[PDB]
RNA sequence: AACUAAUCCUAGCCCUAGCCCUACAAAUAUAAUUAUACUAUUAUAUAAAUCAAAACAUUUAUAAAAGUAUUGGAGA
RNA sequence: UCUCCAGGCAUACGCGUAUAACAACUCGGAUAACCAUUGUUAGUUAAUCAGAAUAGGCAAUAAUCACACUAUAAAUCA
């Protein structure tokens, strides 16, 4: 869940449960060359790597072995017609290696007459 | 932003209204929702224009410019598909008609009779002719997308008709979070310590 | 067509929570396909599907919020979930 | 544009609307009413007429009150209307002499006075005039209660007045504890100043204090809509039964 | 440079109600038994209705009439303008 | 989690969210709905509607029978305090 | 009849009149916009001068009676 | 491939996408080729690299390969 307030925890407090999840993730073909089991994901910047591990294991029942994540800086060089800098939204790329010996491969999605010129052919005269 | 025949936000619209354009705005007399009486499918008579005096059915209404489009009327001929290889193909393209250029037609007597808005027994607003008072029923227009609701067949991820119509909500003294707990049997005995809200 | 608010209200509290994930799963798949399309520089087939799912998800959230808001007002009379 | 009401009328509008309108009428009357302080350093003109210099004819005259500065320390003490006079002086009382910047300081003192109503001795900043006024008032407690706010010229004195008025109003046993017979005599002795409890609470309260007090009075925990509907449902059903 | 396009044609009606009724009741005082002075019919700023003065006098009269209702920014600007006007007329 | 002394991270299990995933087996609701299905006119639920649907029938029967009193207001569904519930209506102490 | 250029009317404003006013989430004064402890927390004396007195010094505006009288380096 | 020149690589600081690929040839490089330019898309992966409890009791003797050895500028929480 993103853009929401999380309950503050105190000693002896309840375990944190998210009944409704606002996190939305996208599977992306790796830009770089990565092992087949490794999978690249674009996830909200507020999500932690542990959250992805629980997210895949619970929502999608996907076994995960290892996770590596990076934060990509959004270029702000772009300017509008008014010369106002435009900032690309920052996104987080997560490299997730499958467990139990599972392997992943990106699906192949999106698999007149020439002799008489200048006289319109309509004329029969 | 000058509204044109091209739909707003289209590629043609962008050419018509580029970001740097500062042309003199076109002034169009405001028309209230109650005042407006022309709707798609309405048979109307063209008061003035190329096809003045020819009655047609409305197919598009750009209320921002008070424009009414009649299919097969006020239709000029233009070249579609103009390219380097081929000159293009002549096609008949309709031109916008202003609201004052058309008037509603009484069904029994075909004339440009001025109309006044009045409710009916059912409560639906219907235009009534000022003279020879009569009810002009709202015309039937086909769905723009072309999808007939009855003919539509559920595709993948589309609920069946009965499933959508089923009602399962039971009013009770429990929130959704509590309701989910009962079904899945979530129980928590831990308690948050006192927090001073401020 | 996307889920309307009234139909979601007819559905039970447990059903609403179940439906939210179903819509979310479709939204992620459509989002997953769209991002690949951006990488491939290709259009997304039937982009209206994502809009329909988002509209359904938005309707779900308010319906659930309505039930929570009503009970909070009844038991406490507070018009806002957060003290202020 | 131009403001329909002048700036001075802006305050009146606020007083007449909002929480200010909801303030108690007795407190509002006390705030609204203004009483001129008793002259101390200036006397009214002896004659009511004088020869107008410009036209050479007899004309009516007016009185100009002398400017006196009352420091906030006076509001924390009991000054008998005395105050600091800041201005210029001419040596030897002739305008032909040099002008010297002079600040005139009345002789100030801190002394202890016994309050019968509060049964405690308070050490406070006081002047000789106040002590004479206390004797003229027939007691320190009488002086605080009898003297008006402007003549009293002390916020603490008003604070004493609020406590004294409330104490008399409530017939509180706190006065002279373990001596009920003595308590009755004090109340009888100061019976003239007995007033309703509500009025005494707001005596001497500052504007900021008054606004907070009214806000505290009017703030109430939100009513659970369940309770409101329950009462409404019961009331409607009860009417139907009739 | 000069216009290359014609201005829109304009026709003015000299017998409109405003022009036709212009000046009516200008003799209210003499023809109304002098109950109402013609100065009472003047419409304009309050401080100069039935009164005339130089620019300095007009500004000063404006300050007195609406000084209590004037904005602080306007009042401050008027004081500064008055000071410049006062020096020029009374010393030059 | 919480960072303890020595600049050492100590993950707190309680503060780590647990994703409650519903069971979608046998669930007939899907991401999209039929065009055959008529659109639903919005009728947002309100405290009055919730009270009328559930609480009103109980009080109405009880009031006619005369078995109504302040102490039994909780019987009809009033909660004196939100403490003891995992999800507290006010102050909101639970996430979506 | 050519190039460079030029052409235009609304973008809007000004003064009176009238009118007082009472118009998402998330984060924030800590280092503002940093989801929870640190470290207590806080504006303001005549307005002056410039300026006028051709410098400069007391001084220098900020309905009728009437610019009459007084005051003033009796001068602005 | 040949001829010749000889401060190179990491970190800090600063900069903030100038990085890489594709597509363009108008503008930027004080000329071209080519891009550092224009448009679009991609990118930098860390338990090891880097950043982000309390109250009492008690301490004489520098370093310099610290041993000898001296010196003066007087130099170590547990």
Curated annotation (Swiss-Prot), chain A:
Q: GO biological process: any one? A: translation
Location comes to:
Mitochondrion
Q: Name one Pfam family in it.
A: Ribosomal_L23
Q: Which GO terms describe its cellular component?
A: cytosolic ribosome; mitochondrial inner membrane; mitochondrial large ribosomal subunit; mitochondrion
Here the disulfide bonds are none
Keywords, A to Z?
A: Mitochondrion, Ribonucleoprotein, Ribosomal protein
Subunit relationships? Component of the mitochondrial ribosome large subunit (39S) which comprises a 16S rRNA and about 50 distinct proteins.
Name the family. Answer: Belongs to the universal ribosomal protein uL23 family.
This chain's protein is named: Large ribosomal subunit protein uL23m
Encoding gene (name): Mrpl23
Curated annotation (Swiss-Prot), chain B:
Which residue ranges does the record assign to the KOW domain? 38-71
Q: Which domain of life is it from?
A: Eukaryota
**Alphabetically ordered keywords of this record:** Mitochondrion, Phosphoprotein, Ribonucleoprotein, Ribosomal protein, Transit peptide
> Which residues does the record list as Phosphoserine (modified residue)?
6
One example of a Gene Ontology biological process annotation: mitochondrial translation
- MF (Gene Ontology): RNA binding; structural constituent of ribosome
Cellular location(s): Mitochondrion
- Record's InterPro entries? KOW, Rib_uL2_dom2, Ribosomal_uL24, Ribosomal_uL24_CS, Ribosomal_uL24_KOW, Translation_prot_SH3-like_sf
Taken from the UniProt entry, a GO cellular component term is: mitochondrial inner membrane
- Pfam short name (any one): ribosomal_L24
Q: Into which family does the record put it?
A: Belongs to the universal ribosomal protein uL24 family.
According to the record's subunit comment, the protein's assembly and interactions are: Component of the mitochondrial ribosome large subunit (39S) which comprises a 16S rRNA and about 50 distinct proteins.
- NCBIfam families, sorted: rplX_bact
How is this protein named in the record? Answer: Large ribosomal subunit protein uL24m
Curated annotation (Swiss-Prot), chain E:
Q: Where in the cell is it found?
A: Mitochondrion
* UniProt keyword list: Mitochondrion, Ribonucleoprotein, Ribosomal protein, Transit peptide
MF annotations from Gene Ontology? structural constituent of ribosome
Q: What is its main location?
A: mitochondrion
Taxonomy, superkingdom: Eukaryota
Q: Where are the transmembrane segments?
A: none
Q: Does the keyword Transit peptide apply?
A: yes
Q: Which GO terms describe its biological process?
A: mitochondrial translation; translation
Q: Which GO terms describe its cellular component?
A: mitochondrial inner membrane; mitochondrial large ribosomal subunit; mitochondrial ribosome; mitochondrion
Similarity comment: family membership: Belongs to the mitochondrion-specific ribosomal protein mL51 family.
Q: How does it assemble?
A: Component of the mitochondrial ribosome large subunit (39S) which comprises a 16S rRNA and about 50 distinct proteins. Interacts with OXA1L.
**Under what name is this protein listed?**
Large ribosomal subunit protein mL51
Q: Which organism is it from?
A: Mus musculus (Mouse)
**The encoding gene:** Mrpl51
Residues shown, of full length: 33 to 124 of 128
Curated annotation (Swiss-Prot), chain F:
Q: Which GO terms describe its cellular component?
A: mitochondrial inner membrane; mitochondrial large ribosomal subunit; mitochondrion; ribonucleoprotein complex
Kindly state a single biological-process term from the GO annotations of this entry: apoptotic process
Where it sits in the cell: the answer is: Mitochondrion
Note the superkingdom of the native organism. Answer: Eukaryota
Task: Tell me if Ligase is a UniProt keyword of this record.
Answer: no
Q: Determine if Transit peptide is one of this entry's keywords.
A: yes
Q: Which UniProt keywords apply?
A: Apoptosis, Cell cycle, Mitochondrion, Ribonucleoprotein, Ribosomal protein, Transit peptide
A GO molecular-function term, please? structural constituent of ribosome
Query: What is this protein's function per UniProt?
Result: Component of the mitochondrial ribosome large subunit. Also involved in apoptosis and cell cycle. Enhances p53/TP53 stability, thereby contributing to p53/TP53-induced apoptosis in response to growth-inhibitory condition. Enhances p53/TP53 translocation to the mitochondria. Has the ability to arrest the cell cycle at the G1 phase, possibly by stabilizing the CDKN1A and CDKN1B (p27Kip1) proteins.
Provide the assembly information.
Answer: Component of the mitochondrial ribosome large subunit (39S) which comprises a 16S rRNA and about 50 distinct proteins. Interacts with BCL2.
Tell me which family the UniProt entry assigns to this protein: Belongs to the mitochondrion-specific ribosomal protein mL41 family.
Q: What is the protein's given name?
A: Large ribosomal subunit protein mL41
Q: Which gene encodes it?
A: Mrpl41
């Amino acid at each position: 869940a993103r853009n929401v307030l999380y309950p503050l925890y105190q000693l002896g407090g309840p375990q944190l449960r998210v009944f409704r999840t606002n996190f939305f993730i996208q599977l992306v073909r790796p830009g770089t060359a990565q092992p087949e089991d490794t999978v690249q994901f674009r996830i909200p910047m507020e999500m932690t790597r542990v959250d992805l591990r629980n997210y895949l294991e619970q929502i999608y029942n996907v076994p995960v072995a290892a996770v590596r994540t990076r934060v990509q800086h959004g270029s702000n060089r772009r300017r509008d017609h008014k010369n106002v800098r435009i900032k690309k939204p920052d996104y987080k790329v997560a490299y997730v290696q499958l467990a139990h010996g599972q392997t992943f491969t990106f699906p192949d999605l999106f698999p007149s007459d020439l002799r008489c010129p200048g006289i319109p052919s309509w004329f029969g005269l | 932003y000058r509204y044109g025949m091209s739909r707003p936000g289209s590629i043609a619209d962008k050419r018509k209204n580029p970001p740097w354009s500062r042309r003199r705005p076109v002034v169009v007399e405001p028309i209230s929702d109650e005042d407006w009486h022309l709707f798609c499918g309405d048979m109307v008579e063209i008061l003035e224009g190329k096809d003045a005096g020819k009655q047609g059915k409305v197919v598009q209404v750009v209320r921002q410019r008070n424009w009414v489009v009649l299919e097969g009327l006020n239709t000029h001929y233009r070249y579609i598909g103009r390219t380097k290889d081929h000159r293009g193909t002549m096609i008949a393209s309709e031109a916008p008609l202003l609201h004052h250029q058309v008037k509603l037609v009484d069904p029994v007597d075909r004339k440009p009779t001025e109309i006044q808005w009045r409710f009916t027994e059912a409560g639906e607003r219907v235009r009534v002719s000022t003279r020879s008072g009569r009810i002009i029923p709202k015309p039937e227009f086909p769905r723009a997308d072309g999808i007939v609701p009855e003919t539509w067949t559920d595709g993948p991820k589309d609920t069946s008709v009965e499933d959508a119509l089923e009602r399962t909500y039971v009013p009770r003294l429990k929130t959704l979070e509590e309701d989910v707990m009962e079904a899945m049997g979530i129980q928590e005995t831990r308690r948050f310590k006192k927090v001073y809200w401020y | 067509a996307s889920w309307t608010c009234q139909q979601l209200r007819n559905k039970s509290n447990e059903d609403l929570h179940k439906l939210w994930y179903v819509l979310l799963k479709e939204r992620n798949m459509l989002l997953t396909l769209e991002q690949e399309a951006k990488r491939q520089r290709l259009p997304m087939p039937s982009p209206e599907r994502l809009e329909k799912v988002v509209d359904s998800m938005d309707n779900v959230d308010k319906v659930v919020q309505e039930r929570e808001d009503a009970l909070r007002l009844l038991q406490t009379g507070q018009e806002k979930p957060r003290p202020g | 544009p131009l403001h329909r009401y002048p700036v001075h009328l802006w305050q009146k509008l606020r007083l007449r609307q909002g929480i200010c309108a909801r303030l108690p009428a007795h407190f509002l009357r006390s705030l609204e009413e203004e009483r001129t302080p008793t002259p101390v350093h200036y006397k009214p003109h002896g004659t009511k007429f004088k020869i107008n210099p410009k036209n050479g004819q007899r004309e009516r005259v007016e009185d100009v009150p002398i400017p006196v500065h009352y420091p906030p320390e006076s509001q924390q003490g009991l000054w008998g209307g005395e105050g600091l006079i800041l201005g210029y002086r001419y040596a030897n009382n002739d305008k032909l002499s040099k002008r010297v910047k002079k600040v005139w300081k009345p002789q100030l003192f801190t002394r202890e006075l016994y309050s019968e109503i509060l049964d405690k001795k308070f050490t406070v900043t006081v002047t000789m005039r106040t002590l004479d006024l206390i004797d003229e008032a027939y007691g320190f407690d009488f002086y605080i209660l009898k003297t008006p706010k402007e003549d009293l010229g002390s916020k603490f004195g008003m604070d004493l007045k609020r406590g004294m008025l409330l104490r008399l109003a409530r017939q509180d046993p706190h006065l002279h504890p373990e001596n009920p017979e003595r308590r009755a005599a004090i109340y009888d002795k100061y019976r003239s100043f007995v007033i309703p409890e509500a009025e005494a609470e707001w005596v001497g309260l500052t504007l900021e204090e008054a606004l907070e007090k009214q806000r505290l009075l009017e703030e109430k925990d939100p009513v659970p809509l369940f309770k409101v509907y329950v009462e409404e449902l019961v009331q409607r059903l009860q009417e139907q039964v009739l | 440079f000069v216009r290359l396009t014609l201005p829109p044609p304009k026709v003015v009606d000299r017998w409109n109600e405003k022009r036709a009724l212009f000046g009516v009741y200008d003799n209210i005082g003499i023809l109304g038994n002098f109950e109402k002075h013609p100065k009472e019919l003047i419409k304009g700023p309050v401080w100069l209705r039935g009164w005339r003065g130089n620019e300095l006098q007009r500004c000063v009269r404006k300050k007195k009439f609406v000084g209590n209702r004037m904005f602080i920014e306007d009042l401050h600007n008027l004081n500064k303008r008055i000071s410049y006007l006062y020096k020029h007329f009374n010393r030059h | 989690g919480i960072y303890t002394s020595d600049r050492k991270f100590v993950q707190i299990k309680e503060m780590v969210p647990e994703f409650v995933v519903p069971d979608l087996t046998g669930f007939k609701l899907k991401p999209y709905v039929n065009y055959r299905a008529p659109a639903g006119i919005d009728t947002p639920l309100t405290a009055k509607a919730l009270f009328q649907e559930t609480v009103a029938p109980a009080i109405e029967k009880d009031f006619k029978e005369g078995t109504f009193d302040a102490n039994n207001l909780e019987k009809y569904g009033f909660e004196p305090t939100q403490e003891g519930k995992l999800f507290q209506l006010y102050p909101k102490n639970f996430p979506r």
